[PDB]
């Protein structure tokens with residue numbers, strides 16, 4: 001591909017971290033723009049972020065061209081990179097294996113994503129989070145990533161599982177000291193050994209390393225978030 | 230495609246209907262196995278999915294009645310994944326458009342359905358919550374459509390994903406099914422025939438005209454009957 005690619009995100013957005021991982025896996029040449037400025041309504045009138053501009057002239061990100069195609073919705077941005085760079089095999093080759101990668105993302109979206117938010121941001125009962133974590137965990141093979149090799153599955157879920165672990169280790173979140181104790185114990189137990197290794201293997205992935213600030217930075221960022229208290 | 234395809238669904242499931250639409254759009258040779266919602270699910274279904282998940286596809290393996298699933302078939306669940314599977318198996322059907330950008334916009338339209346309207350359909354019709362959010366989400370979805378035609382001009386998986394749900398909620402509305410108050414029902418019915426919602430009204434009848442929808446829908450009267458036997462849709466006395 002030769003069209004210009006520009007990815008827009010807020011600095012520590014997990015949704016934008018999705019698109020950042022996939023552009024890295026793809027070997028793409030792209031501009032990265034972290035931040036809401038007045039100009040941004042030219043990327044998306046609604047202020048939706050993350051966003052990708054595609055095609056048009058090379059432009060500084062804060063001057064998006066009227067010619068470029070503008071795209072939003074993080075999981076569609078994943079599919080987009082995969083489609084633009086088929087040669088990077090961001091998804092596997094067979095339809096069945098692609099179907100399992102997508103099913104795995106749906107498990108995260110439909111079952112775990114909201115309870116992660118209940119347990120860590122709304123201080124709600126933690127029980128359902130751990131069950132949804134297990135359910136996603138159960139869809140992993142004994143080794144490797146969700147469908148064996150790295151795929152959009154990982155781009156989709158990595159930013160969120162890595163932040164969960166970072167928060168739990170750091171005691172950030174709105175859960176009770178009691179529920180926080182219960183989650184630290186679950187994640188360190190054999191029940192959740194598979195998912196814990198998954199995150200470890202995720203965190204070793206070069207595309208994750210590059211698009212993660214480092215634990216230092218993510219932590220400094222984290223400790224300026226209200227909903228984490 | 231030479232592999233056998235079998236689609237398992239509880240009857241009248243909008244989730245299974247998604248994949249039905251897509252198999253009909255694809256021109257696929259497929260076997261359709263309907264399970265009764267209100268029975269328990271046959272013991273044999275565990276061989277298609279141990280947790281009883283529907284809808285589900287078996288792919289390949291030997292040719293077998295659906296109640297005799299072969300272990301040699303690959304088994305897939307999750308309706309939005311099943312849509313992308315059919316497109317992947319039948320690329321000549323162009324269930325998604327050709328360019329990455331248009332593909333991305335079709336997938337984004339599915340996201341808007343899921344992020345906003347899907348849960349207000351449940352809240353307003355099955356839980357009886359105030360319906361203002363439901364209208365606003367319908368508007369949000371409506372504003373993502375182009376001036377005419379389908380979400381990305383030509384029909385795509387966007388319609389496979391959203392048609393089963395948009396059609397049932399408009400069916401339920403005109404017939405007054407749901408847990409919402411009777412005032413909120415007149416509010417919704419009035420809003421839907423208003424000019425505010427002309428575009429989404431045009432989208433729904435354009436959906437209902439599509440061959441693949443007609444054949445997988447099997448008529449309003451049988452969808453009404455199916456819905457009058459969903460207990461969660463009944464206001465209590």
Ligand SMILES: Oc1cc(O)cc(/C=C/c2ccc(O)cc2O)c1
Nearest residue numbers: 241242243346347348350351397398
């Ligand atoms: O058998 C039927 C008939 C029908 O009309 C709708 C449904 C389900 C709708 C639904 C479920 C979960 C959710 O979060 C949101 C939803 O809209 C099932």
Ligand SMILES: Oc1cc(O)cc(/C=C\c2ccc(O)cc2O)c1
Nearest residue numbers: 075102105106109309336340343344
């Ligand atoms: O790779 C793909 C492609 C696609 O079209 C859909 C999905 C999955 C789930 C999904 C999408 C959007 C959303 O807001 C919620 C969802 O559950 C996965």
Ligand SMILES: [Mg+2]
Nearest residue numbers: 349352358362
């Ligand atoms: Mg609600």
